[PDB]
Amino acid sequence: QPRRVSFRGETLQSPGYDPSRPESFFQQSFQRLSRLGHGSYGEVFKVRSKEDGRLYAVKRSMSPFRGPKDRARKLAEVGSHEKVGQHPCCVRLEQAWEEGGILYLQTELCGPSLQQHCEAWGASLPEAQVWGYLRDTLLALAHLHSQGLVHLDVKPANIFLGPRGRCKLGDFGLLVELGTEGDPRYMAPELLQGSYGTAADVFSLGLTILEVACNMELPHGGEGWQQLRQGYLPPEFTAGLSSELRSVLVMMLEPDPKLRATAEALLALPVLRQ
Amino acid sequence: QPRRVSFRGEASETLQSPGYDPSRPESFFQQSFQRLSRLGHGSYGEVFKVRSKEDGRLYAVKRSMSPFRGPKDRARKLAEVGSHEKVGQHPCCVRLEQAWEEGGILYLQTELCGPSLQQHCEAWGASLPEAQVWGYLRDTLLALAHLHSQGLVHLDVKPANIFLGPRGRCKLGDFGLLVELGTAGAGEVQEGDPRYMAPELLQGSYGTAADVFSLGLTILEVACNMELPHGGEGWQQLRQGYLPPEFTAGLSSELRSVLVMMLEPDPKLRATAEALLALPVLRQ
Amino acid sequence: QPRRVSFRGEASETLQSPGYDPSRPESFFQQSFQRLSRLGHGSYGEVFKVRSKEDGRLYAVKRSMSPFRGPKDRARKLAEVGSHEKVGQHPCCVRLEQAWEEGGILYLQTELCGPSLQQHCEAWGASLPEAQVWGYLRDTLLALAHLHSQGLVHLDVKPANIFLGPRGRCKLGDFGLLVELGTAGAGEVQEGDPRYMAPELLQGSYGTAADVFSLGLTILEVACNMELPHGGEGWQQLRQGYLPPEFTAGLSSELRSVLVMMLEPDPKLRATAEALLALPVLRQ
Amino acid sequence: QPRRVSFRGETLQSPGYDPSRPESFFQQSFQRLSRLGHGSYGEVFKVRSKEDGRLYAVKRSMSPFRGPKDRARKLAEVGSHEKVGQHPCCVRLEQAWEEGGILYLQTELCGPSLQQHCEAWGASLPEAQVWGYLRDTLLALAHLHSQGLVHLDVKPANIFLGPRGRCKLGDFGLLVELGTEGDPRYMAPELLQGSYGTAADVFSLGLTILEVACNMELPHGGEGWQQLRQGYLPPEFTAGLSSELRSVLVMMLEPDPKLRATAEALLALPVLRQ
Amino acid sequence: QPRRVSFRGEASETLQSPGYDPSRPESFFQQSFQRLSRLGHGSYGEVFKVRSKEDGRLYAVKRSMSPFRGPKDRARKLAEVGSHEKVGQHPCCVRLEQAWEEGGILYLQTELCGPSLQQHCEAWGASLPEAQVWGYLRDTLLALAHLHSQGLVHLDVKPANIFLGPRGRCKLGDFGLLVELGTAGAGEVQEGDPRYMAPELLQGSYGTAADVFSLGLTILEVACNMELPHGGEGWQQLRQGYLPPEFTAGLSSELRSVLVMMLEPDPKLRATAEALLALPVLRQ
Amino acid sequence: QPRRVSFRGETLQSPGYDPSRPESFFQQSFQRLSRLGHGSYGEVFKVRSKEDGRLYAVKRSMSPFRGPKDRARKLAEVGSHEKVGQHPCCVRLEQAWEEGGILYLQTELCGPSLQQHCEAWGASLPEAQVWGYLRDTLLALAHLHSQGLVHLDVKPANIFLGPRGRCKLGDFGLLVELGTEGDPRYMAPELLQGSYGTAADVFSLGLTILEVACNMELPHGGEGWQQLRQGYLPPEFTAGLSSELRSVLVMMLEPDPKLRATAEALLALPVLRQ
Ligand SMILES: Cc1ncc(-c2cc3cc(-c4c(C)ccc(O)c4C)cnc3[nH]2)cn1
Ligand SMILES: Cc1ncc(-c2cc3cc(-c4c(C)ccc(O)c4C)cnc3[nH]2)cn1
Ligand SMILES: Cc1ncc(-c2cc3cc(-c4c(C)ccc(O)c4C)cnc3[nH]2)cn1
Ligand SMILES: Cc1ncc(-c2cc3cc(-c4c(C)ccc(O)c4C)cnc3[nH]2)cn1
Ligand SMILES: Cc1ncc(-c2cc3cc(-c4c(C)ccc(O)c4C)cnc3[nH]2)cn1
Ligand SMILES: Cc1ncc(-c2cc3cc(-c4c(C)ccc(O)c4C)cnc3[nH]2)cn1
Ligand SMILES: [Cl-]
Ligand SMILES: [Cl-]
Ligand SMILES: [Cl-]
């Protein structure tokens, strides 16, 4: 039966929903409009709430909980998302629940990922658009880092467009509360030395941005991959970009964490206000 | 500098080849192979089609993206070699020539295989000759009978991890999740694929039978040209041994009939590779 | 028309006998056997004492009531053949001569056995010679040692599924629930008998030891001429290794003593057939 | 501890019952008078409620729940029984509960099964008695079928006499709600073709009745078994029966489901009113 | 009077020795051995250093405090003999010469071993030569490879149950909790030690890998001269594969590196003895 | 999350304790002052309640519940301790709870065990001290036996000094309610014959006392061990003891349970009042 899942400690009710009928709460409480993703995790659906008639995205897990490591891992993501709270540059969880060991996360409906969007574009992607996504994501970072949180998976796949283009940060499954693994492609190098902080996310975002700005897939290994983490920009990757944008990325990809700019620090720069 | 990675180890762990000079700054992989193409790229790193400068033969070499990111990462990467080795040579199992590390980077050199079943069957329509399927079925069953006889379970049987070999013979690959039954213990499989998972895994315990289901689904998927259910009702039905007519139709009663045996929800009633390979429709 | 059912299969699956003409409308079973008596009837169908017209020898043939009612039904029925075959020949295990199907009807032909222990001991009072028991004990232990050595577990050990053979030698039968450990995986046994079940089965996981308990109870039941508890307090006590005096009394300290070893609640401390058959009171 | 089991979504209380004492709720809340059955499932007891001093039958499961398939299967039977509701020709569940993974169903005390009763009789069983059992069971069927339910196990073992002989239908463990296996002896033939409906139960009842009317055990296989499912009455099985009764059974055993009479249709016939 | 206890049994169960006269009221143990010292005393009873009057050789004889206190007690005591026997002879496994009972008292005669690792390393400081450790590591790994090859799991691997042998060779002992995988079934280990327990045991199921973790911790403990966490945060960290710097430091990267492989939380990724003994640092 | 564990059938609250913080209830609700024991079971800590600022001892289990046999066995001890109730010669449980499958028992802080204390003494242990411990423990026994309870593990390890020396009986994990194993060293002989009662505990206490009085470790086997259970006092073990004390122990170590004195009977003797 449906149980609200929240770390702000719990039954659910809605129009369209009759506990005695066989169909699930999800099945009964929403119209399914499209499938926005699918893979290991399950499926993401475009849904209209029969409660309010508003659009949302719901994430359904594929199989029931396989055990505690599956359950714990799955439920961590809610705990995380909640700890983030409401921010206009961070994907918003309306509510979560389980029914038959299946986990559903109800969020604000976001548009495509930056990866999808920039892919659909050519390399003719306006540097304007980029700056917007940059500021927009730094704001998301600035918000998380100030709360003592590191996302650890900052990449175009995990960043979605809102209505009016404002880009928001999502997939908080790998988010950690400092004190209490991520994509090797966007991995910060301090991580290889067992050391991490908020800096990590800034590096990843540096690369998130370099990738979409250049419309060049980032190296999957070899010398290419090392160079970036020794703060070397390939001229192959720095053409068609404003001396302004390039200089910023240099400061985001500074190999020394202790020397790498902050989100707040970056959002202080003239090019990154308004 | 290049350390051989093997659990059948030897006091010959320094690596040598034609075209390789240690005093040159290039890596062994850069010096020792001609990269002819890239066959894959993802989280794991990259796979290249390469010519050996030593023996001039063609291979696949999987190179890991970053160095070892940590103890778990190192263990996970090395476990694949350990597994791949436990399998041994079988004509229906991807052969590993050798594995080595250099500055924390794991390289696996295997025989060069064609594309995965996923790719191959994607590339066919539902025009896929049911004949080819039986081939794939038999060829993978043989691989399993070989693994299962040796008390090994793969736990990642799927069209993605099944590659086409010399002529038509399809090879079972990606021994990342393979376990030796009795070593680990039948417990929760964390990093498994739920799309192909056997029902008994949801209750924690498993056996070889697990792989037979997974192959059931693997074959069903490619046989139908249908993507398998990613959750909800559809997904549970297959693990309660219901064949939703949308799939079962288009497939000879003969083929239809077998998959049933493979998809029996009860591991204890589910056919073995040994047993299935005894049926006439799957011999020679 | 008659298709042989075997998982040691062959390209000789069409069936032939003296007295069998394919062009006659009678079934192979009707044509090929003289039915001398009916030894059983229930849900499963029927068992007949029959003379082979081929070799004139006496057998038991179990014929299934209906055709295959569905995929589960077909699988369940065929799994018994598969199991019965995995057992092999042992003087203390019911021998299968052959299995076949015809219009969806499964027939199992075994050696002709006498009545089950249940029947035989029912028919005795508590006048049952304790001597006979040891025989049954030893004879069934041998059967288990044979199964367990081969990594097989029966999971349906009970006086109902134990039949008397040529002279006195009691045979273990009904391999319907038998599993190959490592194939299925130690998980919930759905269609088991709780009256003889080992405690460890309530916690999902099991081993060969399971059968030893079941035989513990099997022997206890017939040794006492007492029906075993069908639930409540009485039932839990046996699986917490308490011997309620109402049973333990009337049985030689020697016999009493052994059943204890067999009924140890902890599979990890419970005796093996191998080990028990080493004790002097159970040799030759 | 005792938990009410009901799909009409739950603690229990009674005289004789002290939560602090070791003995179970069942042990404490009833006197045990006889054992009415025993087998795979556990035991059925004749009980006097210490609450009301009224007679009931309680069904105790033998072992604790062996796992989810055991628990689910066991609990299905309650769900089923509830969905049936109160009918004078259907066995009545007072309440169900579990305590230490043991499942108890409390029903109205029924007399013996038709199988027991007709066995205890000879073949001298009045055709009168039969008609009563026939009408009585059709009523049970008529009630279930109108609610969209198929019993799937309609046989003399699963039909009990009430006080004043009125025969009631029981064992709803195999009952299914159309939309959302049975005895081969009483199995309808459409079932062999993957097709089922309410008709199934009518066929089974046709055979339930043929059996007790003839005091002949029904074929366990061979040609005997097939014939019936090709609508052939053996003259061995149709002697000593009224042309009336025989004709009815013909209509109940019509091999084509789409051609087989309904409970309502049958209860409309002159011989089957009063 | 003295009955030999063996599950490789024989029709020679009455016991005889030089210095033993049955008609004397003294026990066999009192008559047949010279007690030279007491090597242990606890709940179990007592262990003595003894000279055989038969063969004049030195042994350890463990004598049980009371007679058999009950069926569980008898079973528990006899299971150790049964296990100790299943192990067989291995130079790195404590050898049992014989076991016998007399008036309900179980005696186990083994080779005479030196002190346990616990004692030996207690008696050293952190001045313990890391060299000795590798020896102990390798020597115990060999013991496990021997057990694991034979489908046996010890489930009580710890410095207490590891004794020093002829010269330096450390021997694995106390086979009280040892189980034969497939006999019992992977289920809850009641009388286990949580201080050395592998994580997978908390989820009910296990394999040989269990012992490798336990040895991981065994070696970590003695390598550090640190007592292991008896609960709270500290205890869970080791079973989630975190090496709290307080331990990991002071140990060669080489040694540090290996323990990681042994302490991998995921049994399915955790190294085998076979595999570890292949690494150069652990050969000859 | 924290759940009160009691068989008097349950959330917990306290100062210092914030449900949202990561640290456990135990971690948050107490200061840890010393570790009083450690072994198989886990650890015993000297704690100051942040609630009341009073001293207690808490017993933490080492690993989460390993399964039902581990959980049941662990929880039995609470059930037991509760059934004992409040007595000045019996260790007092304030409360118990679990959090993350870890079990905590909160008791009155006791001083060292008799084993510890008498060990720390020589054999110069005043016979006075002994008598006090004897009476004090008989009172504990008298209380338990009158309630139909046998402790089954009566030894110097399981008996602690209170403030003002009054010795109290603890570790009720092996306590049984007559109707509804112990240390072989202090084992009563009837036990070897499958028979037990309240007498058992009296024998064990007879030996508990003999041991500390003599400052001699009790035989671990051989003839030594049998003799005591055939009511034979070794002169090695009866020197330096008052004819009074010796005679008492004879009556406590009477091999025949049916002939062995009671706690009440013993507490009736002149030497054992005040
Ligand atoms: C073409 C196209 N493709 C995909 C999308 C899309 C994916 C998506 C995922 C979430 C989400 C959910 C649902 C749960 C947790 C969580 O962190 C997130 C980010 C929300 N909105 C989304 N929109 C839109 N358009
Ligand atoms: C179009 C196309 N796409 C992909 C391929 C291809 C991928 C591939 C991977 C391995 C391999 C490696 C390299 C390491 C470990 C391991 O388990 C395996 C299976 C071997 N042969 C391969 N061929 C060919 N053609
Ligand atoms: C009074 C009396 N009652 C019953 C018998 C009897 C039943 C019986 C069943 C089989 C058999 C069959 C036929 C198939 C599969 C299978 O596992 C088995 C054990 C073999 N021999 C039998 N003898 C004899 N006498
Ligand atoms: C000689 C004799 N033998 C047996 C009986 C008898 C069996 C019986 C079973 C139920 C019952 C129960 C208890 C639970 C669920 C359920 O569907 C049912 C039908 C109710 N009343 C019964 N009476 C009477 N007389
Ligand atoms: C200082 C000191 N302390 C302890 C010893 C010591 C204890 C010991 C126990 C056994 C033994 C026995 C006797 C029975 C069963 C069994 O598994 C074992 C391992 C064998 N050898 C031993 N040596 C030596 N020196
Ligand atoms: C030197 C020294 N060492 C140890 C102690 C000491 C141990 C101890 C154990 C409990 C206790 C607990 C905590 C739980 C359940 C239970 O039955 C009991 C008896 C209470 N108080 C104690 N004090 C004092 N001084
Ligand atoms: Cl793959
Ligand atoms: Cl049977
Ligand atoms: Cl030990």
Side-chain angles (χ1 to χ4, degrees), chain A residues 27 32 35 38-43 60-71 100 102 181-185 187 191-194 217 219-223 225-226, chain B residues 26 30 35 38 41-46 63-70 76 188-195 197 201-204 227-233 235-236:
Chain A
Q27 230 291 346
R32 263 130 91 186
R35 192 164 74 167
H38 57 107
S40 262
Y41 58 88
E43 305 159 290
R60 191 165 72 178
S61 73
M62 176 171 326
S63 71
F65 301 114
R66 296 174 235 169
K69 293 178 178 181
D70 188 40
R71 185 170 203 278
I102 300 298
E181 205 134 72
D183 192 330
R185 259 159 287 169
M187 175 161 57
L191 281 146
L192 287 191
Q193 300 302 335
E217 200 132 281
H220 285 256
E223 288 186 8
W225 189 94
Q226 263 290 330
Chain B
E26 282 73 63
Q30 294 178 65
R35 278 132 87 166
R38 197 176 69 173
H41 54 97
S43 325
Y44 62 81
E46 285 169 298
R63 165 178 73 186
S64 77
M65 172 135 33
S66 75
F68 300 119
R69 313 169 58 196
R76 227 141 105 265
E188 183 192 340
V189 177
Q190 299 85 17
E191 246 260 274
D193 199 326
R195 230 245 290 208
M197 208 157 63
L201 274 80
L202 303 177
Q203 266 203 289
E227 200 188 73
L228 296 165
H230 283 248
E233 209 160 283
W235 182 97
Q236 265 158 33

Side-chain angles (χ1 to χ4, degrees), chain A residues 36 44 57-59 77 81 91 105 107-112 116 160 170-172:
Chain A
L36 293 180
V44 182
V58 162
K59 181 147 109 283
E77 181 172 22
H81 213 117
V91 174
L105 304 205
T107 80
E108 71 192 308
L109 178 54
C110 308
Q116 293 209 70
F160 304 80
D171 199 358
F172 300 114

Side-chain angles (χ1 to χ4, degrees), chain E residues 16-280:
Chain E
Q16 307 155 37
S17 175
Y20 183 58
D21 162 47
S23 32
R24 256 195 259 106
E26 282 73 63
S27 78
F28 177 92
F29 176 52
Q30 294 178 65
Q31 290 190 46
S32 308
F33 299 86
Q34 277 228 330
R35 278 132 87 166
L36 311 190
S37 68
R38 197 176 69 173
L39 299 170
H41 54 97
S43 325
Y44 62 81
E46 285 169 298
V47 181
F48 305 87
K49 171 152 69 163
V50 300
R51 185 167 298 286
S52 172
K53 294 193 185 192
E54 170 153 323
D55 63 61
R57 292 175 43 80
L58 297 186
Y59 300 85
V61 157
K62 174 147 138 265
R63 165 178 73 186
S64 77
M65 172 135 33
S66 75
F68 300 119
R69 313 169 58 196
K72 182 93 190 170
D73 189 59
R74 188 189 246 261
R76 227 141 105 265
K77 284 160 154 182
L78 292 187
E80 190 178 5
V81 190
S83 300
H84 219 137
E85 280 183 331
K86 264 186 269 200
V87 171
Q89 271 144 244
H90 185 289
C92 290
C93 296
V94 174
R95 199 189 59 89
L96 177 64
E97 220 275 324
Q98 68 192 339
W100 75 96
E101 59 144 306
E102 200 182 334
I105 308 296
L106 190 60
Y107 312 78
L108 304 215
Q109 188 181 354
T110 70
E111 57 179 318
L112 174 60
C113 294
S116 76
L117 267 181
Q118 186 221 73
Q119 289 199 82
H120 175 81
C121 297
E122 194 69 31
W124 279 98
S127 64
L128 224 211
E130 212 204 71
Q132 291 240 48
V133 170
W134 291 96
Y136 310 154
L137 177 43
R138 205 194 81 104
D139 286 339
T140 322
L141 275 172
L142 285 154
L144 285 188
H146 176 74
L147 260 56
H148 295 166
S149 58
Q150 296 185 272
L152 296 177
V153 192
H154 191 300
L155 304 169
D156 207 5
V157 177
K158 62 170 166 201
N161 288 341
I162 295 176
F163 306 80
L164 291 166
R167 204 318 197 102
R169 308 303 295 286
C170 65
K171 304 259 178 70
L172 181 59
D174 209 330
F175 299 117
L177 302 191
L178 179 156
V179 316
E180 188 170 6
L181 264 197
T183 308
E188 183 192 340
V189 177
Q190 299 85 17
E191 246 260 274
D193 199 326
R195 230 245 290 208
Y196 303 96
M197 208 157 63
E200 57 267 45
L201 274 80
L202 303 177
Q203 266 203 289
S205 183
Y206 57 89
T208 68
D211 290 339
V212 170
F213 192 92
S214 301
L215 184 55
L217 294 191
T218 302
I219 286 308
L220 180 58
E221 180 157 82
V222 304
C224 291
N225 190 37
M226 286 274 211
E227 200 188 73
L228 296 165
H230 283 248
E233 209 160 283
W235 182 97
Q236 265 158 33
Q237 292 166 354
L238 298 178
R239 306 181 158 71
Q240 296 176 342
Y242 179 65
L243 276 166
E246 30 257 280
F247 293 85
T248 167
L251 305 184
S252 65
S253 289
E254 298 90 325
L255 170 50
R256 185 168 55 79
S257 160
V258 171
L259 279 168
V260 155
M261 307 183 78
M262 314 204 61
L263 294 181
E264 171 42 59
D266 192 359
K268 294 154 215 123
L269 298 176
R270 195 180 304 142
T272 70
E274 220 198 1
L276 287 156
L277 283 162
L279 307 174

Side-chain angles (χ1 to χ4, degrees), chain F residues 17-217:
Chain F
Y17 179 61
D18 184 52
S20 68
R21 288 181 189 175
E23 303 100 326
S24 86
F25 174 90
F26 176 52
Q27 230 291 346
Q28 285 183 77
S29 311
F30 301 88
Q31 304 182 315
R32 263 130 91 186
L33 305 184
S34 69
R35 192 164 74 167
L36 293 180
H38 57 107
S40 262
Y41 58 88
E43 305 159 290
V44 182
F45 297 107
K46 187 163 83 153
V47 296
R48 192 161 299 286
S49 182
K50 295 195 192 187
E51 155 83 341
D52 51 39
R54 282 190 25 68
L55 276 182
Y56 307 87
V58 162
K59 181 147 109 283
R60 191 165 72 178
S61 73
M62 176 171 326
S63 71
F65 301 114
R66 296 174 235 169
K69 293 178 178 181
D70 188 40
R71 185 170 203 278
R73 256 254 158 161
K74 282 174 165 172
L75 291 175
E77 181 172 22
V78 197
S80 296
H81 213 117
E82 284 184 328
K83 291 198 283 191
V84 171
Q86 300 80 347
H87 194 283
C89 296
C90 298
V91 174
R92 183 197 72 82
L93 181 65
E94 213 260 294
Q95 68 187 0
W97 75 99
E98 69 195 303
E99 194 191 351
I102 300 298
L103 187 55
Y104 316 77
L105 304 205
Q106 196 181 329
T107 80
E108 71 192 308
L109 178 54
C110 308
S113 94
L114 276 178
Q115 189 231 52
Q116 293 209 70
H117 173 88
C118 297
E119 208 153 323
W121 266 106
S124 59
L125 189 74
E127 203 187 300
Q129 296 252 83
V130 174
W131 286 107
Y133 310 149
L134 182 42
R135 198 189 92 115
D136 286 342
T137 315
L138 292 161
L139 287 164
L141 283 186
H143 173 68
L144 261 58
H145 292 167
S146 56
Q147 298 186 267
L149 311 182
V150 183
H151 185 301
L152 292 177
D153 209 14
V154 169
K155 60 188 186 160
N158 291 337
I159 300 171
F160 304 80
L161 299 180
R164 302 338 234 90
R166 304 309 304 287
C167 90
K168 307 211 195 75
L169 184 57
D171 199 358
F172 300 114
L174 288 189
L175 179 131
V176 301
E177 181 171 335
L178 259 161
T180 296
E181 205 134 72
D183 192 330
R185 259 159 287 169
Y186 309 95
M187 175 161 57
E190 52 267 41
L191 281 146
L192 287 191
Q193 300 302 335
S195 191
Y196 69 98
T198 53
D201 287 346
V202 177
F203 193 90
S204 314
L205 184 51
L207 292 185
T208 307
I209 292 291
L210 173 59
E211 185 165 29
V212 299
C214 279
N215 182 58
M216 281 278 284
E217 200 132 281

Side-chain angles (χ1 to χ4, degrees), chain F residues 245-267:
Chain F
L245 181 52
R246 168 221 49 122
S247 62
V248 178
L249 294 185
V250 174
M251 295 158 200
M252 303 190 80
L253 302 174
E254 166 47 40
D256 197 324
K258 287 137 179 211
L259 282 187
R260 191 180 304 144
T262 86
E264 285 100 332
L266 282 159
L267 284 158

Side-chain angles (χ1 to χ4, degrees), chain B residues 181 205-209 264 267-268 278, chain C residues 7 72 182-186 188 190:
Chain B
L181 264 197
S205 183
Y206 57 89
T208 68
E264 171 42 59
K268 294 154 215 123
Chain C
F7 301 101
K72 182 93 190 170
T183 308
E188 183 192 340
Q190 299 85 17

